[PDB]
Amino acid sequence: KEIPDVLVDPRTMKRYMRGRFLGKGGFAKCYEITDMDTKEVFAGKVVPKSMLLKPHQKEKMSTEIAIHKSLDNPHVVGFHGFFEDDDFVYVVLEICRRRSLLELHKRRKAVTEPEARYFMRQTIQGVQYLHNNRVIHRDLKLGNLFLNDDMDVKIGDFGLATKIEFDGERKKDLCGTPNYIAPEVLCKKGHSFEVDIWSLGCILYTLLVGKPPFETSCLKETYIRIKKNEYSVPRHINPVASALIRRMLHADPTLRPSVAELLTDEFFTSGYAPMRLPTSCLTVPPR
C-alpha cells in the first residue's frame, strides 16, 4: 500500500501534491500537501483503511469530522475537507510548521511568566469559541496546542471532543483516555464544560513549573493524585498565578472559573503580556 504522490478528491476535484513528511501519530501519517492549482499549502493526514476496520472506529472519526468541520476561529486548527480512495482516508488541515507546545515545553522547561500569559490567553480565546459553540474539547494538552510560523496557538485534535445540545447536560461516557483528566471523569460522576478548564489548569501549571502537577512514573498513582486533588504549586511561583491555578484545579467543577472569567483574571491584567512572540521561544527564553 504505497501512498500516491498526487492526492485527488472525487468530489471537489482538487489535486494535492504530497510533499515533505511532517510526522506520524497512531495509525495516521501526516504530510505537507500543496494544492497543485493554487499553490496553497496544507497539512494532509493519510490514514490507511486497515486502521478503520471496525464500524466502531469509523464512528469516532465521523463524529470528530462533523465537530471539526463546523469550526472557524483563528485559534483552532482549520478543517479544510476530507476525502478517500480504496486505500486511504485523506484529511486536509491548516499547516502548523512550528510543532506543538509540547516540543517547546520539553526544550524550554519552565517558561517565563509573560510567555505563559501569551500562550494561555490565545489558548483560552480558542477554548471560549469552542464553549460558546457548545463544544467541549475534553482532551486539551500541550501536544494539541499547535504553533504556526507566527507562534500562534492553534487548538487541534478533537478525537475526544463532544457537542452538547441542551442546558445543564452532563456527559457520562468517554471513549478514550485524556492526558490531564478531570476528577469528575475518573469517578464517572458526569461531566460538562468545566473539564476543559481543569486541563487548562494543568497546562498553565506545566508551562510555569516545568513539570505536570500529577506527573508520576506509575499510572495508577497518577489517578489517585487526581481523585484526592493532591498537588502543590511551588512557593517560587507568583501568588497571582498560583491563585488562578488553584481555582482552575478546584475539586468542585462548579467552583472552577468559566472560560469568560479566565481572560479578565488578575494574572492576565497585571503583569507584562506580550502580543507577539519570536520563533526563538521554541529554544531559548525571550531577551
Ligand SMILES: Cc1cc(NC(=O)/N=c2/[nH]cc(CCNc3cc(Nc4nc[nH]n4)ncn3)s2)c(C(F)(F)F)o1
Ligand atoms: C486519524 C485522524 C486524526 C484526525 N484528526 C486530526 O488529525 N486532527 C488534527 N487536529 C489538528 C491537527 C494539526 C495538524 N496540522 C499539522 C500537523 C503537523 N504534524 C503532525 N501532526 C501529526 N503528526 N505530525 N505539522 C503541521 N501541521 S491534526 C482525524 C479526522 F480528521 F479524520 F477526524 O483522523
